[PDB]
Amino acid sequence: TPPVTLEAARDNDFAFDWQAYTPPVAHRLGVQEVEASIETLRNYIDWTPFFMTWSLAGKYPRILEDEVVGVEAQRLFKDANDMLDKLSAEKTLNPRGVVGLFPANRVGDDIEIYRDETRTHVINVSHHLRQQTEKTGFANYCLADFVAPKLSGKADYIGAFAVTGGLEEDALADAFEAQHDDYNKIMVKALADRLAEAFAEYLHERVRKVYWGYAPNENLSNEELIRENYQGIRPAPGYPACPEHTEKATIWELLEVEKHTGMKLTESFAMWPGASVSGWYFSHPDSKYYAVAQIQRDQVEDYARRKGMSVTEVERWLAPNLGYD
Ligand SMILES: C[S@@+](CC[C@H](N)C(=O)[O-])C[C@H]1O[C@@H](n2cnc3c(N)ncnc32)[C@H](O)[C@@H]1O
């Protein structure tokens, strides 16, 4: 579909009656360091991507009873759970995280994050991009649209998180590598990945039910969590609704991630440990995932101004989303 101007895209933002809506108030404002044991997180693992890493097709648990691949899948699952048992008993891989909730309001394509409920001084801005092609029967979506506009006067909130399977991932993998034990190197990295993703799932549930507290009586099974049968989203910088990786620096500052977890950002804004997830929390019932996709020079230049970057810098960080040479 052909591109639209930045102004035309913004004129087609997500349409919602903010005057009639009361955004749920975050129960626990502030930043809290968290941990979770392997024993806790293993009940939140989604095993299907684990088998994909091992090049096996099928959804868990049915894959275990498969007539062609089930026997190999059962051995992988047994070895994985034997390793989880050992890591758990020996405390050699320790998942850690941090969560924060803040007063927030939308201004334009950005979300202002306030020091306090006076909603005056801004401690950080979460910057977002907007879909920029012709939409038929849908808004030109921007994640900022799911937070009440400052002009509406409605008290709204935003969350953020960072979690890891554990800082020990590299030391455990590097030991297997030194032994030329490629099977167990792959296994421990795959388990750290499952633990990080399980922590992101568990912590999101904690936020919906307790920290934000808008769904205190939610009672979903793990299969229902995997199907995303809850209200709200947890979009992560680098993924299609917020592809720009440098926004992880804002999460790192907002949550003091390195102080609270030991997790670090690289010069490419990749996370360390490898088995890590970071992102935002949105409570709005209509919030959803989508792809920003290709954007034009007008939006690139505007994003650069908002970010305090040159156009040249932004063209590096937005290279995959540029709809022009
Ligand atoms: C990567 S899966 C994680 C849970 C899944 N059961 C698993 O283990 O792989 C889904 C997560 O990716 C992120 N995500 C997926 N699509 C996205 C999009 N279009 N924009 C932003 N984040 C997205 C969100 O953080 C979402 O919770």
119 among annotated binding-site residues: no
Reading phi first (left if > 0) and then psi (alpha if -120 to 50, else beta), residue 183 is in alpha
What's the token pair of residue 11?
A: 């004129």
Contacts of 6 (CB under 8 A, 6+ apart): 130, 132, 296, 298, 299, 302
Look up residue 185 and give its amino acid: K
Contacts of 103 (CB under 8 A, 6+ apart): 26, 29, 113, 114, 116, 117, 119, 155, 156, 157
| Residue in 50, 60, 39 with CA at minimum distance from that of residue 222 | 60
How many angstroms separate the Cα of 169 from the Cα of each of 39, 64, 175, 266, 275?
A: 17, 27, 10, 17, 8
Look up residue 245 and give its amino acid: H
> Judging by beta carbons within 10 Å of its beta carbon (0-12, 13-18, 19+), is residue 268 exposed, middle or buried?
exposed
Coil vs helix vs strand at 203: helix
Quote the CA–CA distance of 64 and 77 in Å, as a whole number: 9
C-alpha 14 – ligand 1 centre gap (Å) = 21
Ligand 1 proximity of 279 Cβ (cutoff 6 Å): yes
| Residue in 2, 243, 288, 241 with CA at minimum distance from that of residue 135 | 2
Quote the CA–CA distance of 277 and 21 in Å, as a whole number: 31
Find the discontinuities in the chain where C to next N exceeds 2.5 angstroms and give the residue preceding each.
Answer: none
Contacts of 303 (CB under 8 A, 6+ apart): 127, 129, 244, 309, 314, 318
Ligand 1 proximity of 289 Cβ (cutoff 6 Å): yes
Cβ-count burial 155-165 (b if 16+ within 10 Å, e if not): bbbbbbbbbbb
What's the token pair of residue 164?
A: 């890891």
CA atoms within 13 A on the CB side of 272: 10
Contact 159, 235 (CB under 8 A): no
| Upstream peptide bond of 243 is cis (omega within 30 degrees of 0) | no
Ligand 1 proximity of 241 Cβ (cutoff 6 Å): yes
Quote the CA–CA distance of 191 and 169 in Å, as a whole number: 9
What's the token pair of residue 19?
A: 């005057």
Contact 122, 113 (CB under 8 A): yes
Coil vs helix vs strand at 235: coil
How many angstroms separate the Cα of 88 from the Cα of each of 71, 75, 105, 164, 324?
A: 26, 20, 42, 15, 50
How many angstroms separate the Cα of 315 from the Cα of each of 131, 150, 234, 238?
A: 17, 29, 26, 15
Compute φ and ψ for 311, nearest 5 degrees: -60, -40
Contacts of 245 (CB under 8 A, 6+ apart): 237, 238, 268, 269, 270, 317
| Upstream peptide bond of 285 is cis (omega within 30 degrees of 0) | no
Coil vs helix vs strand at 223: helix
- Taking each helix axis from N to C end, the angle separating 169-178 and 182-206, rounded to the nearest 10 degrees, works out to 170
> Judging by beta carbons within 10 Å of its beta carbon (0-12, 13-18, 19+), is residue 232 exposed, middle or buried?
buried
Give kind and range of the element (H or E) at residue 40.
helix 38-41
Compute φ and ψ for 234, nearest 5 degrees: -130, 60
Quote the CA–CA distance of 17 and 99 in Å, as a whole number: 29
Quote the CA–CA distance of 324 and 35 in Å, as a whole number: 44
| Residue in 64, 157, 55, 73 with CA at minimum distance from that of residue 116 | 157
Coil vs helix vs strand at 286: coil
| Residue in 172, 201, 21, 199 with CA at minimum distance from that of residue 87 | 172
Ligand 1 proximity of 193 Cβ (cutoff 6 Å): no
Contact 251, 162 (CB under 8 A): yes
Which ligand 1 atom is the nearest neighbour of the CA of 197?
A: 8
Q: What technique determined this structure?
A: X-ray
Q: Whose CA is nearest to atom 14 of ligand 1?
A: 235
DSSP result, 145-191: GGS-BGGGT--EEEEEEEEES-TTHHHHHHHHHHTT-HHHHHHHHHH
298 among annotated binding-site residues: no
Look up residue 98 and give its amino acid: V
Quote the CA–CA distance of 288 and 147 in Å, as a whole number: 13
> Judging by beta carbons within 10 Å of its beta carbon (0-12, 13-18, 19+), is residue 299 exposed, middle or buried?
buried
To one decimal, the resolution in angstroms is 1.5
C-alpha 160 – ligand 1 centre gap (Å) = 14
What's the token pair of residue 231?
A: 């209200």
Integer-rounded Cα radius of gyration of the chain: 21
Give kind and range of the element (H or E) at residue 101.
strand 96-107
Ligand 1 proximity of 324 Cβ (cutoff 6 Å): no
Quote the CA–CA distance of 224 and 160 in Å, as a whole number: 22
Q: Whose CA is nearest to atom 22 of ligand 1?
A: 235
Question: What are the percentages of helix, strand and coil residues in the chain, rounded to 5?
Answer: 40, 20, 40
- Domains, the chain, in order of start with CATH, read 1-35+96-164+193-325 (3.10.196.10), 36-95+165-192 (1.10.288.10)
| Residue in 217, 218, 164 with CA at minimum distance from that of residue 191 | 164
Look up residue 241 and give its amino acid: A
Contacts of 15 (CB under 8 A, 6+ apart): 139
CA atoms within 13 A on the CB side of 231: 17
- Taking each helix axis from N to C end, the angle separating 182-206 and 70-90, rounded to the nearest 10 degrees, works out to 70
